[PDB]
From a paper:
The unfolded protein response is an important cell signaling system that detects the accumulation of misfolded proteins within the endoplasmic reticulum (ER) and carries out a cellular response that attempts to rectify the imbalance. There are three sensor/transducer proteins: Ire1, PERK, and Atf6, that are critical for initiating mammalian UPR cell signaling and give rise to three separate branches of the response. All three proteins have a luminal sensor/transducer domain that in concert with BiP is vital for sensing ER stress, an ER transmembrane region, and a cytosolic domain that propagates the UPR signal (Bertolotti et al, 2000; Schröder & Kaufman, 2005; Ron & Walter, 2007; Zhang & Kaufman, 2008). In an attempt to shed new light upon the mechanism of UPR activation and to rationalize the differences between Ire1 luminal domain structures, we determined the crystal structures of PERK luminal domains in two different states: one state is the previously characterized dimer arrangement as seen with Ire1, and the other state is a novel tetramer arrangement.
Concurrently, we also expressed and purified mouse PERK luminal domain encompassing residues 101–399 based on the human PERK-optimized construct. The crystal structure of mouse PERK luminal domain exhibits a dimer arrangement (Fig3A and B). The monomer component of the dimer structure is very similar in fold to human PERK with a route mean square deviation (rmsd) value of 1.1 Å when superimposing the two monomer structures together (Fig3C). The only significant difference between the mouse and human monomer is that in the mouse structure, the tetramer subdomain is disordered. The tetramer subdomain is disordered and is not visible within the structure. Superimposition of the mouse PERK dimer with the dimer component of human PERK tetramer structure again reveals a very close match with an rmsd value of 1.0 Å (Fig3D). This indicates that the spatial arrangement of the monomers forming the dimer interface is conserved between PERK species. Furthermore, since the dimer interface is present in both dimer and tetramer structures, this suggests that this is a biologically relevant and stable dimer interface. We found that mouse PERK luminal domain also forms a dimer–tetramer species that exists in a similar ratio (dim3:2tet) to that of human PERK luminal domain protein (Fig5B). In the yeast Ire1 structure, the α2 helix is disordered, similar to mouse PERK structure.
Numbering used by the authors:
A (entry chain A), B (entry chain A): 103 to 118, 122 to 143, 191 to 207, 211 to 228, 232 to 271, 306 to 355
């Protein structure tokens, strides 16, 4: 087929003449950004994990190891990794946390086994699909959450659909 | 009092005319270094945690929060943080891990509420205590594991006893 991948602010990945959704899968990492307020010591940690998707969770490889799932079909493959920076501030007196924040993002790689164009209206979080003229609209997908990152995955590679 | 703190390769912290041991406490992080062998994707993550010690675990603050313990006595305080870098290599085909390795270290800060000198023979992992002349030996502590980092904590600060 030929689909579009979308990384949103809530930390969500979605995939789409239509733009219908085929699947939307997330990870236990929450939003791609967070903040708070409640001499200091500061704790933290970045983490680059990796999620093996089909076109489905077959494995999750991280800095500790892998968690796998059953079933088969060979088949297709879609690499997906999550980079989550994180750091809290904490009073040396006692772990009372003055404040905290964290940022994150996804990146995409593909592993293997009639055109129009796509632009993303970040103002209204639209995924717009046009045509040729210039260009005439064909469809658009609206997300109920700010779009962080997006790519175009047709053939078997990954063009990053820019802001 | 007046004591000497020692960070060893196994990821262990120890404290010592004597050099007797008053306490030796560790964390669930294993050795300060590790390695292995079994186009690649690479997972990883650094983590800077913090351990609140007395002179005892009262709290462990990390990038996720705190775990505390009971009892009281005010009292004394000894800040101790662990920085653990870690990264595995993993085949894009499937999380089979081509290899992996990790490094780590501790650093010390003090929070409050007749001399001789100390050198560390890294060759035989000795903690040597001398005197004045020159200098004559008074005692030595031998560790059954390579010494990574060491400090001198007398008054209420931290001089790093060098290699």
């Amino acid at each position: 087929a030929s689909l579009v991948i979308i990384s949103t602010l809530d930390g969500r990945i979605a995939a789409l003449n239509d733009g219908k959704k085929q699947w939307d899968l997330d990870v236990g990492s929450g939003s791609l950004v967070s903040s708070s307020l409640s001499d200091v010591v500061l704790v933290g940690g970045k983490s680059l994990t990796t999620y093996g998707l089909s076109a489905k969770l077959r494995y999750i490889c991280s800095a500790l190891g892998c968690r796998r799932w059953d079933s088969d079909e060979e088949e297709d493959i879609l690499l997906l990794q999550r980079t989550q920076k994180t750091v809290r501030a904490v009073g040396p007196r006692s772990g009372s946390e003055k404040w905290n924040f964290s940022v994150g993002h996804f990146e995409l790689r593909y592993i293997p086994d009639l055109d129009t164009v796509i632009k993303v209206s970040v103002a209204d979080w639209k995924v717009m699909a046009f045509s040729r003229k210039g260009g005439r609209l064909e469809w658009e997908y609206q997300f109920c959450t700010p779009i962080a990152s997006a790519w175009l995955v047709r053939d078997g590679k990954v063009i990053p659909i820019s802001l």
